[PDB]
Amino acid sequence: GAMGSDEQPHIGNYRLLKTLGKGNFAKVKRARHILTGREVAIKIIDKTQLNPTSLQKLFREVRIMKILNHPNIIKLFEVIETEKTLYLIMEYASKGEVYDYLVEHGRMKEKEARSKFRQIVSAVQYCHQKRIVHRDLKAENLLLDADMNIKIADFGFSNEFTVGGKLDTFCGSPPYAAPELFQGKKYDGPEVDVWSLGVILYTLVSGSLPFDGQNLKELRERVLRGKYRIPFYMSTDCENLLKRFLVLNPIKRGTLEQIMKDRWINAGHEEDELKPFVEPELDISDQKRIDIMVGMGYSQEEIQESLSKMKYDEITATYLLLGRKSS
Amino acid sequence: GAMGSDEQPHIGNYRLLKTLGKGNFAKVKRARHILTGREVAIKIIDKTQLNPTSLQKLFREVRIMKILNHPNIIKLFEVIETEKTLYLIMEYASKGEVYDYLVEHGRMKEKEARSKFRQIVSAVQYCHQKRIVHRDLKAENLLLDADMNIKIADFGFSNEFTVGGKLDTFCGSPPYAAPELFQGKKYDGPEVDVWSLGVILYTLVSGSLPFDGQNLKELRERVLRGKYRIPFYMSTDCENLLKRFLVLNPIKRGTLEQIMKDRWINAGHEEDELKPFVEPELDISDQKRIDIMVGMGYSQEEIQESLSKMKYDEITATYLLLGRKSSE
Numbered sequence A: 001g002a003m004g005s006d007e008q009p010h011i012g013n014y015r016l017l018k019t020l021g022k023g024n025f026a027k028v029k030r031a032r033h034i035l036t037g038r039e040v041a042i043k044i045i046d047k048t049q050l051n052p053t054s055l056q057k058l059f060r061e062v063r064i065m066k067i068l069n070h071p072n073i074i075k076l077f078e079v080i081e082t083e084k085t086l087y088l089i090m091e092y093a094s095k096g097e098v099y100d101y102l103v104e105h106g107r108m109k110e111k112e113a114r115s116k117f118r119q120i121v122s123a124v125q126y127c128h129q130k131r132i133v134h135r136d137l138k139a140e141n142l143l144l145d146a147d148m149n150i151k152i153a154d155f156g157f158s159n160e161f162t163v164g165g166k167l168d169t170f171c172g173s174p175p176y177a178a179p180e181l182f183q184g185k186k187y188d189g190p191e192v193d194v195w196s197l198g199v200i201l202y203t204l205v206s207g208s209l210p211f212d213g214q215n216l217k218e219l220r221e222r223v224l225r226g227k228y229r230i231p232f233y234m235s236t237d238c239e240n241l242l243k244r245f246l247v248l249n250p251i252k253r254g255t256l257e258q259i260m261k262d263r264w265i266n267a268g269h270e271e272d273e274l275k276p277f278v279e280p281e282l283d284i285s286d287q288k289r290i291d292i293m294v295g296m297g298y299s300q301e302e303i304q305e306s307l308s309k310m311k312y313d314e315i316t317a318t319y320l321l322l323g324r325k326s327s
Numbered sequence B: 001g002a003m004g005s006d007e008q009p010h011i012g013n014y015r016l017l018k019t020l021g022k023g024n025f026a027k028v029k030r031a032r033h034i035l036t037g038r039e040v041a042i043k044i045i046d047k048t049q050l051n052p053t054s055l056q057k058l059f060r061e062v063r064i065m066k067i068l069n070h071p072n073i074i075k076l077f078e079v080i081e082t083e084k085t086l087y088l089i090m091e092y093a094s095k096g097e098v099y100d101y102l103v104e105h106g107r108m109k110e111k112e113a114r115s116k117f118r119q120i121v122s123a124v125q126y127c128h129q130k131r132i133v134h135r136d137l138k139a140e141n142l143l144l145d146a147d148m149n150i151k152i153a154d155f156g157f158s159n160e161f162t163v164g165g166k167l168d169t170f171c172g173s174p175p176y177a178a179p180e181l182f183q184g185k186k187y188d189g190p191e192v193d194v195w196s197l198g199v200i201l202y203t204l205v206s207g208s209l210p211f212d213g214q215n216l217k218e219l220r221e222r223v224l225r226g227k228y229r230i231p232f233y234m235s236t237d238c239e240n241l242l243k244r245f246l247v248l249n250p251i252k253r254g255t256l257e258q259i260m261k262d263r264w265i266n267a268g269h270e271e272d273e274l275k276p277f278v279e280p281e282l283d284i285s286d287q288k289r290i291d292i293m294v295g296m297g298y299s300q301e302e303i304q305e306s307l308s309k310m311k312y313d314e315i316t317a318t319y320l321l322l323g324r325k326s327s328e
């Protein structure tokens, strides 16, 4: 029920603020953790409308969210579940979609594009290492947080539980689709995402899509032809890197691990060559945060049990949120 | 205890020196930290004169100082409080008000104006990050330290605890006001500060105001028309930058995050583009300073305890002051 007088609604330990987007089966709201003051996004999924396959899908998608732990992939902090509703407490990326940002402010200088594209490549390679391929990239998958860091959203999930939902299924994906789709060839390997990453890099450095169609038919023709315009300001090294991604034969595209050695990717990072991401082991014995949580009224044995099992309960969420920047 | 009949008095660990200014409810003095020798400013507020809501304004403004931790914003070092009096120990900007400097020396060359305006834009955008919008940004908020670095004072504050008469807040603010002030609508968004930042930029590079008049009607006329002189010496890039700030329609006024990318803002900083300020984590583990404080008589335990929570007490003040340039 009501938490405080004349206050916003809550769910668990979170104050629910503005709705960011609403869909068929899911809503997303901005929210503030009551205990720590940290800002979060909460995806709200009505379970009463889902059949068993939808439910079992939803469950394993949530489990994938728990497995993926990368600085540029939207991170899960807490799960709250009622009989009728599942709430997923996750990172909030205040600056919205990358392609919307590029439309608004124009192309990124190559230095800034390199910064975001290193983040994109690292995150997607890490998903590929874990055998998660998306094959459905669109602008919605790429977000920016308040520090202009890339946060990849919904990678490897179905759009059944997005705010676009079943209705907007096709609006955003054709510009990123690999030519194998329209040739009638297989469309399930990481090569597909590699092509899409080439489209993404083009949009970062040019502000535009490399294959632009007045409709589905013209977009298909350009994708199958594989030719795209090199702008006068684009560096030769950038142009050569695009050649690693936008290859018509999927067998001849470079793997992401190979492309990580590319010259343009590593300009300005001579002693910092991009390499496959290695998860650090999570520190679950930060006595400073543990003591704060005792102060919040949790017992140290409760804390130890929640962290050691990684339950995505209210304690592990607090501990993780205490490790992030406040306000 | 006393310091002697003909010596300057002390409060806590500070010797009280010359008065910089006095207001209805506050006095500001230059002071010297006894333990480190560092120069500071002390704001002395007589609480016995304050009703409870003026008291809360006072405490609100203290909270704001503790929130704002930026190298071009006046920083709080220590709080001393009795039943009757509140002492706020803070940074001292030994070169005074930007307004006075401009009048004494004339306009800054664009290279020197650029270094200051980067500091100003950084500080104000940082304040906006903290959801602190001033809406009274004017020359009196802008001070200079010994190294000619900008230090912003009173951002987010009322006038209750400033120096001068009660009717001094209005002296400097109209020429910096956004045109929305004169159109009967809301006057509360970050865009208001953005407009004032354009006026500030103009005064740095020209030495005068872009909008003026001999009364409020005349000033309103000039602000609403939005036109202003471009001096012969002003670069085209500086002129183009001013156009991002001094836009009549607040909806179309440039945002600070995008203005930080401007060519003029970044000339001579090509590899070091201006970006939203990122507050670093305070280093509380500098053993060189800790060891110096044990030599003063502080125990290592009490130092550890005072620094773990930001206490604004004698210990944290000493630690921070040891991190600043010594007196010369």
Ligand SMILES: C[C@H](c1ccccc1)N1C(=O)COc2ccc(-c3cnc4ccccn34)nc21
Residues within 6 Å of the ligand: B020, B021, B022, B028, B041, B043, B074, B090, B091, B092, B093, B094, B095, B096, B097, B140, B143, B153, B154, B161, B162, B163
């Ligand atoms: C800005 C202004 C003021 C006070 C006295 C004289 C002139 C202006 N002020 C206030 O109204 C109240 O709050 C303050 C707190 C600190 C400082 C300050 C720090 N360093 C310097 C160096 C020179 C002058 C002032 N200051 N000034 C103010």
Ligand code: NI
Residues within 6 Å of the ligand: A001, A002, A003, A010
């Ligand atoms: Ni309730």
